[PDB]
């Protein structure tokens, strides 16, 4: 019952508040939990294993829809299972239509699944290092960069680029949770000549910014972004001034979902962050809304930097085909 209590603790942590702060920690925890589910649970065929994984994935995704990394890991494990079963047993395209199965047992499938999960974890470990390594090809000397909020990938990007180049960074605090101050302090401690501003100044100073480098929470199927609130205005200003918008996002933040799906997209938190409880009687008559995430259309994004290199949003669909099976979108 150790696995059951681990699953319950994970679900409760997802529901109440994020234990693993970094998304990489969440992905690693999900992968470890899925590995324990595969090993400990007793299954004969591949189909029953897939349906079990689907059940726990549905529970975990229902725990917190905004946290898409859990669902991404579940779907990656499902595609790994499908690929291994196909390899040990014997893609919607025009070629397939013109040219032209579970419930079979294979004893050695489990070891292949386990080793595939292990190599997936190994790849997961070094994503930020790869992004930082390729950072130096996009920053030139005496450049001006703009960042919104706090993202570890972007700060690693900038700190690796700062070892050989001198550039200016402008960080806009992400109100109400003003986490841009922490990133600005961290970058200033590395001597990167940073500046702190509020969101309201973004369009005021974008005319003097050479390029924008941002992180994200989720990349959708069409190349759209689920980012921190205020990123849509940032992208609109960048498009207005034609400054390139670079998104430093690893491959596990890539979700096969589409924008218009149940409208449970943004995450709404207590209005105490926006309007304090000490205002008084006016709070009876005032509707306060505090979204924490924002939708960014794919046409406002210039480039995607990931552990496999640089890509355009127009190619994102292909990265969907190589990662998730079309029958695992619904989960």
């Amino acid at each position: 019952s150790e696995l059951s209590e681990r699953i319950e603790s994970f679900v409760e942590t997802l529901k109440r508040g994020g234990g693993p702060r970094s998304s990489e920690e969440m992905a690693r925890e999900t992968l470890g939990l899925l590995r324990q589910i595969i090993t400990d649970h007793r299954w004969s065929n591949a189909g029953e294993l897939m349906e079990l994984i689907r059940r726990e994935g549905r529970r975990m995704t229902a725990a917190q829809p905004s946290e898409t990394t859990v669902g991404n890991m579940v779907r990656r494990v499902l595609k790994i299972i499908r690929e291994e079963y196909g390899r040990l047993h014997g893609q919607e395209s025009l070629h397939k239509l013109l040219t032209s199965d579970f419930s079979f047992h294979y004893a050695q499938l489990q070891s292949n699944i386990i080793e595939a999960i292990n190599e997936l974890l190994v790849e997961l470990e070094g994503t930020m290092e790869n992004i930082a390594a390729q950072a130096l090809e996009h920053i030139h000397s005496n450049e001006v960069i703009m960042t919104i909020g706090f993202s570890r990938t972007v700060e690693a990007f900038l700190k690796e680029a700062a070892r050989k180049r001198k550039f200016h960074v402008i960080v806009a605090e992400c109100a109400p949770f003003c986490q841009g101050h922490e990133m600005a302090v961290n970058l200033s401690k590395a001597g990167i000549e940073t500046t702190v501003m509020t969101d309201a100044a973004i369009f005021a100073v974008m005319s003097r910014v050479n390029k924008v480098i941002i992180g994200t929470k989720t990349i959708l199927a069409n190349g759209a972004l689920r980012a921190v609130t205020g990123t849509h205005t940032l992208a609109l200003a960048a498009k207005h001034h034609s400054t390139p918008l670079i998104v430093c996002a690893p491959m596990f933040k890539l979700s096969p979902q589409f924008p218009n799906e149940e409208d449970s997209f943004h995450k709404f938190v207590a209005p105490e962050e926006v309007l304090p409880f000490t205002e008084g009687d006016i709070l009876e008559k005032v509707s306060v809304h505090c979204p924490v995430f924002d939708y960014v259309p794919p046409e406002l994004i210039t480039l995607f930097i990931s552990n496999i290199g640089g890509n355009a949003p127009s190619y994102i669909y292909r990265l969907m085909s190589e990662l998730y099976h079309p029958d695992d979108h619904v989960l």
């Binding site: 395209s93 025009l94 239509l97 013109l98 040219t99 589409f258 799906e261 190619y315 994102i316």
Partner: protein
């Protein structure tokens, strides 16, 4: 073998007996039936006869969909001939593969409707150009999901198919409105999104459609409204119109200057809804490349 009278009569009978049938599907079925009755033994001769029957099938119903279906059929027979190499063995396999191909393409409308009906919200205002059965099926699926929405449709002046779709949509108790082709700029500010059909998807991801589609695409882009296109897989064709003048004249005319067809650039299109899934325009070329390698 068919003698240019059995072929055309078969095509017309296929279209007439099933009025809810796409022209491209009827053309593909006619070509498959022609392949069934060949009485010849040569792959080269079969290819020559098929590609010659393409022109006489395109003489009537000169829409782009028929040509796209013919090109797809030719690629299909070439693909089969690669694998087997004995016309005698390859014949039965091509027949069975054509049967499965017809069965698959018969479900494209349902697949597109199921994939696309989730993009319509409650209280949304859909804007449509002309009569297309794919948009009709999408709206039927949306109604079946208990969603409530309004629809505006243009009259499509050269042949009043907009009124036909308005009648077919009032038959489903959907509140619809009919507007002039010149009122699109007046109506775009009220609509939330635009759904149009397609007579063919060109290489770059743009679409080939009825003459009034380009204005709606440009107006939607100006007003920043999403522009969705629903089209079947067999409507992909390797054509690249540089501009309006560059599209072949065999598709403009014959059902002082009244073209029946215009071209919409992929930059004005948000998403394509096909039985292959929901795609960006840039995806289409990829598919249309993978077929020819």
């Amino acid at each position: 073998p068919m003698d240019d009278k059995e072929l055309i009569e078969y095509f017309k009978s296929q279209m007439k007996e099933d009025p809810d049938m796409a022209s491209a599907v009827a053309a593909i079925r006619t070509l498959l039936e022609f392949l069934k009755r060949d009485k010849g033994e040569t792959i080269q001769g079969l290819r020559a006869n098929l590609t010659s029957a393409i022109e006489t099938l395109c003489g009537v119903d000169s829409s782009v969909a028929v040509s796209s279906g013919g090109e797809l059929f030719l690629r299909f027979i070439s693909l089969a001939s690669l694998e087997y190499s004995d016309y005698s063995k390859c014949k039965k396999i091509m027949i069975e593969r054509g049967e499965l191909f017809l069965r698959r393409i018969s479900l494209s409308r349902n697949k597109i409707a199921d994939l696309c009906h989730t993009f319509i919200k409650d209280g949304a205002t859909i804007l449509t150009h002309a009569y297309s059965r794919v948009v009709l099926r999408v709206l039927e699926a949306a109604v079946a999901a208990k969603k409530r929405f309004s629809v505006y449709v243009t009259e499509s002046q050269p042949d009043l198919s907009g009124k036909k779709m308005a009648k077919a949509l009032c038959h489903l108790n959907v509140p619809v409105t009919v507007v002039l082709d010149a009122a699109v700029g007046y109506i775009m500010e009220k609509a939330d999104l635009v759904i149009v059909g397609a007579e063919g998807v060109v290489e770059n991801g743009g679409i080939i459609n009825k003459i009034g589609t380009n204005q709606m695409a440009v107006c939607a882009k100006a007003q920043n409204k999403p522009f969705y296109v629903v089209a079947e897989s067999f409507k992909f064709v390797r054509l690249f119109p540089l501009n309006q003048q560059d599209v072949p004249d065999k598709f403009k005319y014959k059902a002082e200057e009244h073209p029946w067809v215009d071209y919409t650039a992929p930059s004005l299109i948000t998403l394509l809804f096909t039985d292959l899934g929901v795609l960006t325009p840039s995806a289409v070329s990829d598919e249309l490349i993978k077929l020819y390698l």
